[PDB]
Write an enzyme that holds these catalytic residues in place. Structure first.
Site, PDB file in Angstrom:
ATOM      1  N   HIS A  40       4.446  -4.239   0.954  1.00 15.26           N
ATOM      2  CA  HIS A  40       3.994  -3.041   1.696  1.00 15.26           C
ATOM      3  C   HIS A  40       2.455  -2.923   1.781  1.00 15.26           C
ATOM      4  O   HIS A  40       1.942  -2.075   2.482  1.00 15.26           O
ATOM      5  CB  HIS A  40       4.659  -1.727   1.197  1.00 15.26           C
ATOM      6  CG  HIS A  40       4.060  -1.147  -0.055  1.00 15.26           C
ATOM      7  ND1 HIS A  40       4.524  -1.461  -1.318  1.00 15.26           N
ATOM      8  CD2 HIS A  40       3.087  -0.224  -0.234  1.00 15.26           C
ATOM      9  CE1 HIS A  40       3.837  -0.784  -2.222  1.00 15.26           C
ATOM     10  NE2 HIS A  40       2.967  -0.015  -1.591  1.00 15.26           N
ATOM     11  N   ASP A  84       9.850  -6.432  -2.350  1.00 18.43           N
ATOM     12  CA  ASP A  84       8.505  -5.921  -2.038  1.00 18.43           C
ATOM     13  C   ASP A  84       7.484  -6.775  -2.769  1.00 18.43           C
ATOM     14  O   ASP A  84       6.961  -6.373  -3.833  1.00 18.43           O
ATOM     15  CB  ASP A  84       8.371  -4.458  -2.463  1.00 18.43           C
ATOM     16  CG  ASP A  84       7.077  -3.837  -2.009  1.00 18.43           C
ATOM     17  OD1 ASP A  84       6.368  -4.465  -1.185  1.00 18.43           O
ATOM     18  OD2 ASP A  84       6.787  -2.705  -2.463  1.00 18.43           O
ATOM     19  N   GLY A 175      -2.228   3.922  -4.039  1.00 16.35           N
ATOM     20  CA  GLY A 175      -3.470   3.156  -4.299  1.00 16.35           C
ATOM     21  C   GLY A 175      -3.297   2.181  -5.440  1.00 16.35           C
ATOM     22  O   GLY A 175      -4.082   1.219  -5.615  1.00 16.35           O
ATOM     23  N   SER A 177      -0.425   0.637  -5.560  1.00 14.35           N
ATOM     24  CA  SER A 177       0.447  -0.326  -4.834  1.00 14.35           C
ATOM     25  C   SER A 177       0.014  -1.798  -4.951  1.00 14.35           C
ATOM     26  O   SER A 177      -1.156  -2.119  -4.712  1.00 14.35           O
ATOM     27  CB  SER A 177       0.397   0.004  -3.337  1.00 14.35           C
ATOM     28  OG  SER A 177       0.998   1.251  -3.053  1.00 14.35           O
ATOM     29  N   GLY A 178       0.949  -2.681  -5.273  1.00 16.02           N
ATOM     30  CA  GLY A 178       0.674  -4.131  -5.302  1.00 16.02           C
ATOM     31  C   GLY A 178       0.119  -4.608  -6.630  1.00 16.02           C
ATOM     32  O   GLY A 178       0.067  -5.803  -6.892  1.00 16.02           O
TER      33      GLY A 178
HETATM   34  N1  LIG Z   1      13.365   4.131   0.199  1.00 19.02           N
HETATM   35  C1  LIG Z   1      12.796   4.765  -0.827  1.00 19.02           C
HETATM   36  N2  LIG Z   1      12.846   4.185  -2.049  1.00 19.02           N
HETATM   37  N3  LIG Z   1      12.226   5.958  -0.576  1.00 19.02           N
HETATM   38  C2  LIG Z   1      11.597   6.816  -1.584  1.00 19.02           C
HETATM   39  C3  LIG Z   1      10.091   6.511  -1.783  1.00 19.02           C
HETATM   40  C4  LIG Z   1       9.239   6.661  -0.511  1.00 19.02           C
HETATM   41  C5  LIG Z   1       7.729   6.782  -0.839  1.00 19.02           C
HETATM   42  N4  LIG Z   1       7.528   7.847  -1.847  1.00 19.02           N
HETATM   43  S1  LIG Z   1       6.227   8.813  -1.585  1.00 19.02           S
HETATM   44  O1  LIG Z   1       6.124   9.160  -0.130  1.00 19.02           O
HETATM   45  O2  LIG Z   1       6.372  10.065  -2.376  1.00 19.02           O
HETATM   46  C6  LIG Z   1       4.741   7.915  -2.145  1.00 19.02           C
HETATM   47  C7  LIG Z   1       3.536   8.849  -2.228  1.00 19.02           C
HETATM   48  C8  LIG Z   1       2.789   9.103  -1.073  1.00 19.02           C
HETATM   49  C9  LIG Z   1       1.680   9.955  -1.137  1.00 19.02           C
HETATM   50  C10 LIG Z   1       1.336  10.538  -2.365  1.00 19.02           C
HETATM   51  C11 LIG Z   1       2.095  10.283  -3.509  1.00 19.02           C
HETATM   52  C12 LIG Z   1       3.192   9.430  -3.443  1.00 19.02           C
HETATM   53  C13 LIG Z   1       7.106   5.468  -1.350  1.00 19.02           C
HETATM   54  O3  LIG Z   1       6.980   5.259  -2.557  1.00 19.02           O
HETATM   55  N5  LIG Z   1       6.631   4.619  -0.419  1.00 19.02           N
HETATM   56  C14 LIG Z   1       5.961   3.371  -0.807  1.00 19.02           C
HETATM   57  C15 LIG Z   1       4.658   3.794  -1.552  1.00 19.02           C
HETATM   58  O4  LIG Z   1       3.996   4.737  -1.125  1.00 19.02           O
HETATM   59  N6  LIG Z   1       4.294   3.076  -2.605  1.00 19.02           N
HETATM   60  C16 LIG Z   1       3.079   3.450  -3.379  1.00 19.02           C
HETATM   61  C17 LIG Z   1       3.559   4.114  -4.682  1.00 19.02           C
HETATM   62  C18 LIG Z   1       3.267   3.524  -5.913  1.00 19.02           C
HETATM   63  C19 LIG Z   1       3.704   4.122  -7.110  1.00 19.02           C
HETATM   64  C20 LIG Z   1       4.449   5.307  -7.092  1.00 19.02           C
HETATM   65  C21 LIG Z   1       4.888   5.869  -8.301  1.00 19.02           C
HETATM   66  N7  LIG Z   1       5.132   7.171  -8.461  1.00 19.02           N
HETATM   67  N8  LIG Z   1       5.104   5.083  -9.326  1.00 19.02           N
HETATM   68  C22 LIG Z   1       4.729   5.910  -5.860  1.00 19.02           C
HETATM   69  C23 LIG Z   1       4.279   5.303  -4.660  1.00 19.02           C
END
Ligand SMILES: N=C(N)NCCC[C@@H](NS(=O)(=O)Cc1ccccc1)C(=O)NCC(=O)NCc1ccc(C(=N)N)cc1
Ligand SMILES: [Ca+2]
Ligand SMILES: [Cl-]
Length: 223
Positions: A40, A84, A175, A177-178
Site C-alpha cells: 500500500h 501487503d 505514516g 506504514s511499510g
Molecule cells: N479492509 C480492512 N482491513 N479495513 C480496515 C482498515 C482500513 C484502514 N483503517 S484506518 O482508515 O482507520 C487507518 C487510519 C487512517 C487515518 C488515521 C488513522 C488511521 C487502514 O488501515 N488502511 C491502510 C492504512 O491506512 N494503513 C496504515 C496504518 C498503519 C497502522 C495502523 C495501526 N493502527 N496499527 C493503522 C493504519
C-alpha cells in the site's frame, strides 16, 4: 507510533524512510540493494533514505538513493491488504556500516506473546495528529490469531498477524506504514493496517513476513 518512545539516533539501522517530497512510509533494508515495504506504500518517484533519525535535518549519516524498480507482491489485494508487501531495488548499493544495516529475514514464524520492536515516523496521537521528526519505537506482543479475529469486523488472512494492546493506548499509526516489526533479530512483520490507532479492541495488523521469505529470495535472485 502512539505511546512509544524515542528510539535514539540510528539504533534501528535497518529502518528506512520512503520519500517523495516528504516522508510517506517506512521500510526495511534487507541487503545493500533491496528494501521491503508494504504494497500500500506503492507509488513512483520514491527516494529511499537510509541512516535517518531526524527526517527534517541533515545530521551526517544519511544515504539518499533512488529506487530503480518496485515490485508489488503478485497477489496484493488492496481491498483486504492480503499480501501487503513490496520490494524496492536501489539504483546503487547502500554503503553498509553501524548506522546503516540490513535486518535478517526469518527462518521460522514468531509466536503469540513474543515482544517485538515496531518503529516509524508515523502519527503519535490516537485522536488528532502530531508527527515526530525523530524515529519512534514500540515494544508490542504478537496476539493469538483467535484474539485478532475476535476483535475485528474486517478480513484477516493467514498472511497477517496482529500485535499490540487490546486496552488501547499503544500502536503503530498512519505514516508508520511499510515499516518493520522485529522479533528476536528477525523481520517478522510489516506495518499494514488497523482501525484508527491505539483504540480499544482494535490492534495493529501486520504482514506476516515469514510466509514470504521464498518469494523475497527468488525475486531478489532474479532481479
Ligand atoms: N479492509 C480492512 N482491513 N479495513 C480496515 C482498515 C482500513 C484502514 N483503517 S484506518 O482508515 O482507520 C487507518 C487510519 C487512517 C487515518 C488515521 C488513522 C488511521 C487502514 O488501515 N488502511 C491502510 C492504512 O491506512 N494503513 C496504515 C496504518 C498503519 C497502522 C495502523 C495501526 N493502527 N496499527 C493503522 C493504519
Ligand atoms: Ca536526517
Ligand atoms: Cl473492527
Amino acid at each position: 507510533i502512539v505511546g512509544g518512545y524515542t528510539c535514539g539516533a540510528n539504533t534501528v539501522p535497518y529502518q528506512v524512510s520512503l520519500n517523495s517530497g516528504y516522508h510517506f512510509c517506512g521500510g526495511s533494508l534487507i541487503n545493500s540493494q533491496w528494501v521491503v515495504s508494504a504494497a500500500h506504500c506503492y507509488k513512483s518517484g520514491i527516494q529511499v533514505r537510509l541512516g535517518e533519525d531526524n527526517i527534517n535535518v541533515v545530521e551526517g549519516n544519511e544515504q539518499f538513493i533512488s529506487a530503480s524498480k518496485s515490485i508489488v507482491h503478485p497477489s496484493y489485494n488492496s481491498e483486504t491488504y492480503n499480501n501487503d508487501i513490496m520490494l524496492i531495488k536501489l539504483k546503487s548499493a547502500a554503503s553498509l556500516n553501524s548506522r546503516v544495516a540490513s535486518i535478517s529475514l526469518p527462518t521460522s514464524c514468531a509466536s503469540a506473546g513474543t515482544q517485538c520492536l515496531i518503529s516509524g515516523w508515523g502519527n503519535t496521537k490516537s485522536s488528532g495528529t502530531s508527527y515526530p521528526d525523530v524515529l519512534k519505537c514500540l515494544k508490542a506482543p504478537i496476539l493469538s490469531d483467535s484474539s485478532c479475529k475476535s476483535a475485528s469486523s474486517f478480513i484477516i488472512t493467514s498472511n497477517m498477524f496482529c500485535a499490540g494492546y487490546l486496552e488501547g493506548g499503544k500502536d503503530a499509526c498512519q505514516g508508520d506504514s511499510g515499516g518493520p516489526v522485529v522479533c528476536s533479530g528477525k523481520l517478522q512483520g510489516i506495518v499494514s493496517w488497523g482501525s484508527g490507532c491505539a483504540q480499544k479492541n482494535k490492534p495493529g495488523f501486520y504482514t506476516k513476513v515469514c510466509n514470504y521469505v521464498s518469494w523475497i529470495k527468488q525475486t531478489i535472485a532474479s532481479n
